[PDB]
Amino acid sequence: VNSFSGYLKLTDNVYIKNADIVEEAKKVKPTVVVNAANVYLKHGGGVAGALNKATNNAMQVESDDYIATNGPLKVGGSCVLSGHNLAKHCLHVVGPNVNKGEDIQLLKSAYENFNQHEVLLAPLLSAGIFGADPIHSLRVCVDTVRTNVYLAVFDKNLYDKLVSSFL
Numbered sequence: 831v832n833s834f835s836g837y838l839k840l841t842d843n844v845y846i847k848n849a850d851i852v853e854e855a856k857k858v859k860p861t862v863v864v865n866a867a868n869v870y871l872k873h874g875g876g877v878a879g880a881l882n883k884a885t886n887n888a889m890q891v892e893s894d895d896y897i898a899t900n901g902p903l904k905v906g907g908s909c910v911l912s913g914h915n916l917a918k919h920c921l922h923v924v925g926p927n928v929n930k931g932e933d934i935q936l937l938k939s940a941y942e943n944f945n946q947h948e949v950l951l952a953p954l955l956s957a958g959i960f961g962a963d964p965i966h967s968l969r970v971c972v973d974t975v976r977t978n979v980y981l982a983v984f985d986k987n988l989y990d991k992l993v994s995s996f997l
């Protein structure tokens with residue numbers, strides 16, 4: 831038993847809700863919140879900009895030190911950093927950005943990072959300003975992640991479409 835509430839169950843291990851991931855994280859304080867990161871951990875917009883803003887820019891400060899030490903992530907890769915006031919940990923995961931021409935097949939590799947964590951609160955990778963089809967992202971999620979994932983979908987219209995079209 832965990833503290834996630836109001837989720838619709840899609841499969842044995844995948845759950846979904848129309849919610850702002852920032853507010854969901856603030857209330858649940860999950861062990862892991864996933865950020866929709868880029869390889870530079872520059873948290874300007876989308877989910878990343880919103881999560882970072884909620885940490886009063888502490889996420890960005892920590893991220894800049896990480897990059898200065900380690901260099902950029904790989905597309906499809908991840909790193910574990912602090913969750914600040916939102917979670918114990920933040921798993922920064924880089925899905926391919928279609929608006930940069932990155933290979934969509936890397937979306938499966940991105941979701942594989944979730945399997946290193948028993949339970950996660952996460953957005954749909956490569957959705958929103960990353961330009962991929964969210965219906966496809968949900969399918970890859972369900973077919974790749976084996977650990978327990980609670981997906982927060984900000985837009986109510988998209989949430990309804992994702993549920994109604996789910997196979």
Ligand SMILES: O=C(NCc1c(C(=O)O)[nH]c2ccccc12)c1ccc2[nH]c(O)nc2c1
Binds near residue numbers: 850956
């Ligand atoms: O951009 C937001 N969601 C779109 C999105 C999702 C998703 O929703 O599944 N996944 C992504 C991955 C990369 C880029 C964008 C997205 C968002 C989230 C919380 C907010 N809170 C607030 O005040 N504004 C917000 C905007």
